[PDB]
Paper text:
The [name] system, composed of ParA (an ATPase), ParB (a DNA binding protein), and parS (a centromere-like DNA), regulates bacterial chromosome partition. In [name], ParA and ParB homologs are encoded as HpSoj and HpSpo0J ([name] and [name]), respectively. ParA forms as a dimer in the ATP-bound state that can bind to nsDNA through a continuous basic binding patch formed by arginine/lysine residues. The partition complex interacts with the nucleoid-bound ParA forming the nucleoprotein ParA–ParB–DNA complex, known as the nucleoid–adaptor complex (NAC).
In [name]-DNA structures, four lysine residues, Lys199, Lys227, Lys230 and Lys247, have been reported to be involved in non-specific DNA binding, with Lys199 and Lys230 directly binding to DNA. In the HpParAD41A-DNA complex, an additional interaction with DNA involving Lys227 was observed. This conserved Lys227 residue is positioned at the core of the DNA binding surface, between the DNA backbone (4.0 Å) and ATP (3.6 Å). Since HpParAD41A is deficient in ATP hydrolysis ability, Lys227 may interact with the DNA backbone, resulting in the loss of the connection between ATP and DNA binding. The HpParAD41A-DNA complex displays a higher resolution of 2.6 Å compared to that of the [name]–ATP–DNA complex structure (3.4 Å). The ATP-hydrolysis deficient mutant HpParAD41A exhibits low ATP hydrolysis activity and remains in a dimeric state while preserving DNA binding. Therefore, the HpParAD41A–DNA complex may adopt a stable conformation with bound DNA than that of [name]. The [name]–DNA and HpParAD41A-DNA complexes share similar overall structures, featuring an ATP binding pocket and a readily exposed continuous basic DNA binding patch. Once the HpParAD41A-DNA complex is formed, it may maintain a more stable conformation than [name] and undergo a steady interaction with the N-terminus of [name].
Author numbering:
A (entry chain C), B (entry chain D), C (entry chain B), D (entry chain A): 1 to 264
Write the structure that this text describes.
DNA sequence: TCCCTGTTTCACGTGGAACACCCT
DNA sequence: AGGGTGTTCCACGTGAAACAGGGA
């Protein structure tokens, strides 16, 4: 049995990668698939959105990579039966020392997350990883551990040069440490369809990348997460948008996204 | 003559650090004060916002920190006569390794920017530093070099946790590397007043922090940068907002911010 | 022992004359003051609102106006010991002929209600008159027999022309038939404050009339009867709203109205 | 051509008779049929809804019945080309004496409006007559003039007793003065489908009257005018709803009403 | 059987942003 | 095209009313 490993990644800050990672893991779990969410960010917002406050987590993801803990020891069960979580902390910031000290000897350490994952790749249908807003060692680990990658795009000017940067980082990993990697899709998020900027940013991206954007395969239309404040309120209750408000615009787009993952 | 050096910092991604750093440095410079803007981010969104392209620039700030260049060589003149820019590149992400090699040697290297800025500080009234989304080495450098620090707040749930721990980084360095360091002010960003998440997030923030919020000395009112899509448009035109739409509310709010900073 | 006779009048249909007349008379009678309620409408909705079937009572007010009955025989004891009712039939539309044969004859016909009320005026603290939607004879009698007049205002467009029109009827009789007659107050009815029609109608009304709007003497605030569907439900059960839902906002507002009338 | 003459009638005040009569006459005129709106009420709200002022109306509907003018003199043209209006004044209140002065001799005068309509029944497809809130001479005249009768029903407790009375008045006239009179339909107005009262009132009415309610001939569903404050704002601009807001719910139901009339 | 308190559900005002004139 | 205007569209807060347990 094999888990599909998905990275949610962008180096631009505040683009919905944590909201995607939490609400994609949720929307997949309600289809009765076995889901593991890795909060791979030092800010650890994905953990906080599931209602586990940072201070009361005993041992975390940082302890796994060093070899201090097994990954199954740190796995927590969430509110949903088919959702499980590997949390994060401020302690994850110290991974960057551990990475670069390992680089100057064996040049591995991009793979520290893959080898951590190895034990649990057969208990899950899906393992979703939430990355920080940078192209450093945390993100690089996640891209190296992943079968595929979901890219949230806030359609605003810096996405343009930013996306081509992220894909270029993706190309050089395919050709080195992770050939098995694929672009799972591009996910327009915080989407406000009528803005001129949103139109104009989409048009430049569709120009190069259109085949790569998520289709609802049923109706052919694009899957885009609308700007909805209930998506934003939802982590204050420690719940994904499913449990919080299931009929809202955002939850709908997150369910539709789950189906397009499941069709292939 | 000593520059006041103001780092614009928040570790949460996408809260308007770059938009604020670009616009304040512009709004300060129309008063005929000499301003240097430092793009301290590998994403290099500040350099993009002033109409440069990072593929086409010769030497960046990474070449200054490694000592290869003196900082007055990499300085570019912008479209404004009082605004100069130390640009940045993806190559600034290479500073990551170098920090933990300088931590390994001197137990310093947080002061690299501080020692780089020493040649140009009698040359400008204000130096504005745009920090990346982390508590990692670059932001610590931006903070350890600075007299004061602006904290842009997008008024949403992750800010409650996130501001708190940024302050503790500030209190750490206020006891350690940079005891002179001041909090310049709290700057509400992307502000939509009528929203119950925005109200409640600002409510929780006001009981702890109210004295640290930027105010308009004429009216006594809070200075808050409104959500205006024009603020997002101007970097596509390679411009600060005052050269784009000077009458727009975002331009008005950044110039109010500028005036309250110039007062001391 | 002299009754204050309050005509509840507006020529506009459906503005809450009957609801106001029925509910004020109940709210005055729980203060243990004796109230006579006069259904001066052929539609006879007031009689229906107290739970008396139109076809099941012997003689009505029409029979007093034509002299066939002394009014004290036509009086009925309601479910409240302090509320009595002069009921009405469809027969009261038969006053219409009889009026235009009275000024023909004696130049009276204005005063028949005034003279019918002569036997019972020393017998009640308050007498409440519920008038039909016209400036014709029945409203005229109702207005000419009254010490004071309540004007219910549905705050909507026709009220502007409608209220101004009624006042000229009022000041005509103040100049002629009944000079002692005073406006008791304006009573906003079916009130929904948030509506811009309601704000605009009330505003145009306030510049001419504000002094004559009913106020709560304790808080200084206006007395307005809200839209509450409990008020509309109450006559189906044959009750005033204090016998239906005494806790509802519409009940509170009529009791405030009652309190304001009792005090002066 | 013989005009179909339609009375909008009910003796309950403020149930939407004028709003029905103006907006039905309007919704018929956009179908390129020739429409004459007789404002037959003393309060004259139909006229005021079309942006005509009482102070500037020269000779009115009162003058036609007294023989002071022929009807084609007093007819005015509205904003719409296919909508003509016969206006009213405060002077129409003096019709009531003329009726019972003709009753004292020859027992006619119920037919005074019909006889006045003789010259214009061939110049119009539709003549919409708006009656006052009573069963006296003005309503009777127009009920005797009309081919059919539309009953607006505000679904609230007094509709029950009021309707039985208005149907019974129709039976008296079907027997005597106007045998050709049909009930054109029942039109629920100010409709709020959620309320317990509204349900409860309709259920007692459907019990006796169901086939008499207006159906959409297309869908089969009932046609009811919804409570919309745009319907209320609309006369303040001197416009029927279809010029004011043609999109709004109120205008839609009034259009569907016009369609059902147009199929006979 | 009388009560209480959450959730749904629906009309209506609010303000941002696009856009179509319209100025001249 | 530059600078008004107002008009149209869309999210989101607001509060009334029904309803569903949950109260023993
Ligand atoms: N469609 C949406 N509508 C409204 N708010 C959203 C939406 N998606 C995400 N958010 C909110 O926007 C903010 C940024 O989203 P999020 O934090 O998931 O982005 P991020 O890329 O994870 O940020 P970081 O760069 O710190 O990792 C959060 O406050 C979140 O609550
Ligand atoms: N009213 C506003 N104020 C600030 N930024 C805005 C506003 N409206 C839109 N934006 C846009 O919001 C986006 C995020 O802002 P910005 O990139 O300045 O945040 P940041 O803190 O620099 O993010 P990063 O962590 O990626 O550096 C940008 O695309 C900017 O163009
Ligand atoms: N404050 C209120 N809120 C809700 N419904 C009300 C209110 N006041 C009255 N009603 C209802 O509104 C309708 C009109 O009220 P009412 O019959 O008292 O007006 P009116 O002035 O007596 O009209 P008319 O005498 O011309 O028929 C009735 O159905 C009544 O049940
Ligand atoms: N949804 C609606 N449908 C009909 N009328 C409405 C609606 N909303 C508000 N109104 C208003 O209802 C009020 C009474 O309606 P209207 O005046 O047409 O009834 P009416 O029977 O003509 O009254 P009158 O008894 O004075 O003749 C008016 O102020 C009208 O503007
Ligand atoms: Mg995140
Ligand atoms: Mg930035
Ligand atoms: Mg009445
Ligand atoms: Mg009317």
């Amino acid at each position: 049995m094999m888990s599909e490993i998905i990275a949610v990644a962008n180096q631009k800050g505040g683009v919905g990668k944590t909201t995607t990672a939490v609400n994609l893991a949720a929307s997949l779990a309600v289809h009765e698939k076995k889901i593991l969410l890795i909060d791979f960010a030092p800010q650890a917002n994905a953990t906080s959105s599931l209602g586990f406050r940072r201070d009361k987590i005993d041992y975390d993801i940082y302890h796994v990579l060093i070899g201090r803990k097994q990954i199954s020891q740190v796995i927590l069960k969430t509110q949903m039966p088919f959702l499980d979580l590997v949390p994060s902390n401020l302690g994850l910031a110290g991974f960057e020392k551990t990475f670069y000290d390992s680089q100057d000897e064996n040049k591995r350490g991009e793979l520290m997350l893959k080898n951590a994952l190895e034990s649990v790749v057969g208990l899950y249908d899906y393992i979703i990883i939430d990355s920080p807003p940078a192209l450093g060692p945390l993100t690089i680990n996640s891209l190296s551990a992943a079968h595929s990658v979901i890219i949230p795009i806030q359609c605003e000017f810096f996405a343009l040069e930013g996306t081509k940067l992220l894909l270029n980082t993706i190309r050089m990993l395919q050709k080195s440490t992770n050939p098995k990697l694929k672009i799972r899709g591009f996910l327009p998020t915080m989407h406000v369809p009528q803005l001129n900027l949103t139109k104009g940013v989409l048009a430049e991206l569709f120009k190069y990348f259109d085949s790569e954007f998520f289709r609802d395969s049923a109706t052919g239309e694009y899957i885009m997460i609308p700007k909805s404040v209930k998506l934003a309120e939802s982590p204050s209750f420690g719940k994904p948008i499913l449990l919080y408000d299931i009929k809202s615009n955002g939850s709908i787009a997150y369910q539709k996204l789950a189906q397009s993952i499941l069709q292939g």
